[PDB]
Amino acid sequence: ALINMIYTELQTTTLQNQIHNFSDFKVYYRKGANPLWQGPAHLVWKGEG
Amino acid sequence: FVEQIPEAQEEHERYHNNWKDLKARFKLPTIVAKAIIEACPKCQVTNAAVGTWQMDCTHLEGQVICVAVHVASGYIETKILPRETGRETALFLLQVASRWPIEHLHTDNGPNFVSAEMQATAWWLKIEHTTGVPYNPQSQGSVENKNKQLKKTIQQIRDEVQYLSTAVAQATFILNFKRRGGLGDMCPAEALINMIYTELQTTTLQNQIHNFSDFKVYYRKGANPLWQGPAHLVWKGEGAVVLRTDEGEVITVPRRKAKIIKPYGQ
Amino acid sequence: FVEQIPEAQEEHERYHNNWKDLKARFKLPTIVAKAIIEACPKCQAAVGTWQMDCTHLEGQVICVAVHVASGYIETKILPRETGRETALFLLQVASRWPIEHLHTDNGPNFVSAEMQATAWWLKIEHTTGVPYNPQSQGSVENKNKQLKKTIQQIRDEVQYLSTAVAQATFILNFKRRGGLGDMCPAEALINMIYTELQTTTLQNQIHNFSDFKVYYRKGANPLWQGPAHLVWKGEGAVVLRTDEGEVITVPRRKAKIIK
Amino acid sequence: ALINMIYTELQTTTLQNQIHNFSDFKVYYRKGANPLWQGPAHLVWKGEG
Amino acid sequence: FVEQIPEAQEEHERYHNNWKDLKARFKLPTIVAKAIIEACPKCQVTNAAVGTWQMDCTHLEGQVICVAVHVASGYIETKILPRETGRETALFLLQVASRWPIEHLHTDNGPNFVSAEMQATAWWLKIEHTTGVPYNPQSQGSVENKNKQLKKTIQQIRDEVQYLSTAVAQATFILNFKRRGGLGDMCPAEALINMIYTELQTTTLQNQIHNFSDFKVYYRKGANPLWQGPAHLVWKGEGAVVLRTDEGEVITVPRRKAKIIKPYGQ
Amino acid sequence: FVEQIPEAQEEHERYHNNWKDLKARFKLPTIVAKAIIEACPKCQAAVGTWQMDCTHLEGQVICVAVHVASGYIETKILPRETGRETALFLLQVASRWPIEHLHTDNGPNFVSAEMQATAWWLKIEHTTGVPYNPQSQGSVENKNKQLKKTIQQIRDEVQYLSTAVAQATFILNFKRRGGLGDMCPAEALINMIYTELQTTTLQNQIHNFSDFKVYYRKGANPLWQGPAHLVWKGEGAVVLRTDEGEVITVPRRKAKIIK
RNA sequence: AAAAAAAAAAAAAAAA
RNA sequence: AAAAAAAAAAAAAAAA
RNA sequence: UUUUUUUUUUUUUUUU
RNA sequence: UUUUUUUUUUUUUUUU
Ligand SMILES: [Zn+2]
Ligand SMILES: [Zn+2]
Ligand SMILES: [Zn+2]
């Protein structure tokens, strides 16, 4: 179990660092109470909610 | 920048660069670079797909030189064929395809470019072998210019090198790495590497998504000590992780309450 | 990297890292890493490291050059095990990918004058014998074993040995995926080359700092201190090292440089 | 002349510091090449150009 | 917060505050503050304009107490009138108007609130003296509540104070500064100061604009060494100044190239 | 104000400023300024400072209280020059505006027991004699002269002296504008009171830090250092002073507090 | 779709 | 109104 | 595990 | 005063 956790941590870190400057479907978001739009930012997951 | 004047000259003794490369490397003004270029007695002054290559053959000193030229960037590769036959051309195509991704080959209608060996080799790699006049004359002009420049570099270099193959290899090195090009001020090899890396962005994203679709995460929500899961992993951060449960909800869990496991099964 | 210069130095105080590791972890220029490693009295896998070795199969000599950091391989059937043929192979390899370091065993062909002349012409650091890097001591042997293993799977439906060698090299380079990233050797090599190209474009090299002397105002002391050697001249700040061995970044307004 | 310059510097500093958190006609602006709107910011001067 | 329990009690010995003030000052919870308030034997548990004031008179121990109450905030002022007459009321109105801005006075229809002295005093200060039932009953209710609270505080304090005037002054101080109010949890004096400061924002802006319309600035544009101007000043910054020339252009000039002068003439 | 604590200290090393000046310039809390001045071996205009004085006119005594920092004045006709009347006037003044410091000459009425009792009841730091502040030594005399000057312009069209005094006070407070800002005394006083109220609301006072001991980790030394007195406890960082006399702000993660 | 009020959930900082 | 190219003006940083 | 400050979400009610 | 990097403005031309 310990070996599995260490290996999966290493693999997740490597895979996340593999893609850092490119994505698809750049989007704009509104953060907090500020009505001003912000971005563009990379899209990680698009969901119904 | 006068202190760089001697050393740069020494470089022009070994690699016969152009003024653009010297200016970009030693941060020299254009006028002095052109003067340095002219001081040497042996010196004067497309939008195809990523996987498009052309092939050609030339005769020099009773030897056959086969040249494969990238169309978009200008990267070239040269070989000394023993005898002009379909087998040698097929072997050279196989050797070239074992180093760079080839998806479309253009060539003339010569006798050795139509033999059964050529067809078998092109079918093994699953590439489109086109014979005839290219659709865009710009590619043909660029290939002819590359061949002429290669011949000029052989003429410049052969005096210092005893054997033809070594001179051809040195000329290929000089053309690929020393002399710069047009837009972007990049060497042909650098441009080819940049284009290939840019083309390989979607596949890595798809592979990352497919791999992330495998990890499982067990999370603790609120003050309830009982663990929950398993759930699909969406992203793992330094402070907190973002998960997508089987019901479609998106949940942010602190790092101290999430455990990520990749099972040996499946 | 104003806040990175001290902390990185602290690392060299504890674990005694190398300058290459310092560049890899802290994204620092080579000059500041060299200054840091030279400051310490105790001290006195890259993108351009290759390893070349020969092998025999069916009475034919095959020379293989392997990139240690990615696993990319290149093979050539040498007519004879002579210095000229191996030097020509090295020249051909150097004309495609950037080579900055070559390592090979102590064989007679790798010691001949042709290899030395080619290495001098290409400006390549060539070493022989025991590898200085603790790791990568058996990557080439494993690659040779793998190539020999995959050659047999295709030798049946193939006439000439050269075609089989080319097919095996193509399959090894492109049709097999590794671990810890899931990338074939060609993709990993291209990614590493692209990253190194971006870093070197940012660096622009061409330092020639020589032994320029620097007087600096440290803390609230108004009197000039030093003199200290110049390490890095930047528009926003200058990085210097003192005779004691401390690396300090100071703003330009409190730094007087004498040639 | 020196006394006049010193006095006018002091008066400008004091008058500017008097008003620092209120104004009229808050405006939105676009800075540089970024098309995203920004603000709101206090209006100091409105002109034709 | 038990260490604050004794000291706070000592405060309630001198100033008879309420639980809100003790909670806001000593950061005590509501329950313990209410307990402290109940422990004392002598203790139990509008949108008008900024310049709106009301006046009233009360009789206590054979003395006349005149009370002026702010409507919006609840700030009060008290005086001991020697004899109930129009002259004394006019003098008290003048004294109140010499400390705070008064723009509208609401009073009753009494005999001493209609004498010629009151009319002359209200005309001198240019204020609107309204006599009769106020339009909003909330203001009248608040004034009556303030008067009742003043009477209660005077009754609480009189045991420890010899003379009536000192007791009235102490009660006024306690009402104005000690006991807190409603929205915002502020004392009446703090609320009045905040409202007055908020109301005085446009006038300061206009005065600043008028004063800035006087300074002159001489500026140097580009590499031309000849000075230029004079021009109107728009803003002065730590790094650069922004000027508006007579032709309407807006120019940013570095501080080293601008000289600001305010002439003695005009 | 992490970066403001050292620099401000440097000021006290050079010009030996006061803690009030430190608060005015660096916007620092009173406790840290007191710690800074106490740490120096050499060392051992506000919103609530008033000055009260009496005068005579037409056989009537007029008492005037002046705010030194703005010029706001308040006048009252005292029936007699007794201690009780002046104490009542001070109590009335203190019930309208916040008073934290009262200064007056050495007159017999200002020394009587009634004034002391009133000052004790109101918790006012009452001082007499030579003013400790170098300036403001003649503001009250100038204000008295100005009041006597302006009362004559209105005494003609007025019957009773009290009405003239009230009108003169109103004219001086509201109908005359000063210099260096162009603000009448009432506006300046209100602005100063508002700014002080905002600052005190931000401060919230209630420190009671006592003599709690603090062990701190400074620089890269792993061993505990101290013990040092506690100056300010903040969520993000803690400000402490050492026995040597150095004020340092450290993050909470490297601070251990013993009561 | 925006504002206000009441209730519920999670996270960060702080004291124990 | 947006993109690209050529020319002109100002400011900041750096060397002299 | 308990309590304060801040931030991000869900439900109900009152208006536009 | 001269030369490089970056930023902010004005004019002309080619398309949408
Ligand atoms: Zn040449
Ligand atoms: Zn070391
Ligand atoms: Zn009580």
Ligand SMILES: [Zn+2]
């Ligand atoms: Zn001192």
